[PDB]
Design a binder for this molecule. Structure first.
Ligand SMILES: CC(=O)NCCc1ccc(O[C@H]2O[C@H](CO)[C@@H](O)[C@H](O)[C@@H]2O)cc1
Ligand SMILES: [Ca+2]
Ligand SMILES: [Cl-]
Length: 136
């Protein structure tokens, strides 16, 4: 139900529902909140989605579903979308990911630009964005 979901504070964009939180959490506690609402921290897989997210974020920092996984620590999406390193290079802040302090294994939307993402420590608290597909 689109009207029911939206009226609980979600936004509908191109077939997906998005929740922009108002309380900050660590990355995994954010993901746990998303899981409790049949969702995950958002993936980003097109310029139009990145644009919707950074514009709605409005210059505030939000965890998204970016996290390192595997033995090599390659970036991944918690909703299990395969990570496209080539397509995603345009979406990082220049100089990121930089693994500052050798402990930045999660990702957020930080800058209000198409170049928006930064890697930050997973145990830091930020606002966060859940994403849930609409299934009619
Ligand atoms: C606001 C401020 O006092 N900045 C100057 C001191 C400083 C320098 C780096 C830093 O790390 C943050 O910024 C880095 C980019 O510079 C990010 O790569 C990193 O993930 C994290 O977001 C945090 C503070
Ligand atoms: Ca960083
Ligand atoms: Cl919230």
């Amino acid at each position: 139900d689109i009207l029911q979901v939206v009226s609980q504070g979600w936004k509908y964009f191109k077939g997906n529902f998005y929740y922009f939180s108002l309380i900050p959490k660590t990355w995994y506690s954010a993901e746990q909140f998303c899981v409790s609402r049949n969702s995950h921290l958002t993936s980003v897989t097109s310029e139009s989605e990145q644009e919707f997210l950074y514009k709605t974020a409005g210059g505030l920092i939000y965890w998204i579903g970016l996290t390192k996984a595997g033995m090599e620590g390659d970036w991944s999406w918690v909703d299990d979308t395969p990570f496209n390193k080539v397509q995603s290079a345009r979406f990082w802040i220049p100089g990121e990911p930089n693994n500052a302090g050798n402990n930045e294994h999660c990702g957020n939307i930080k800058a209000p630009s198409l170049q928006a993402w930064n890697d930050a420590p997973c145990d830091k608290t930020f606002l966060f964005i859940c994403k849930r597909p609409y299934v009619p």
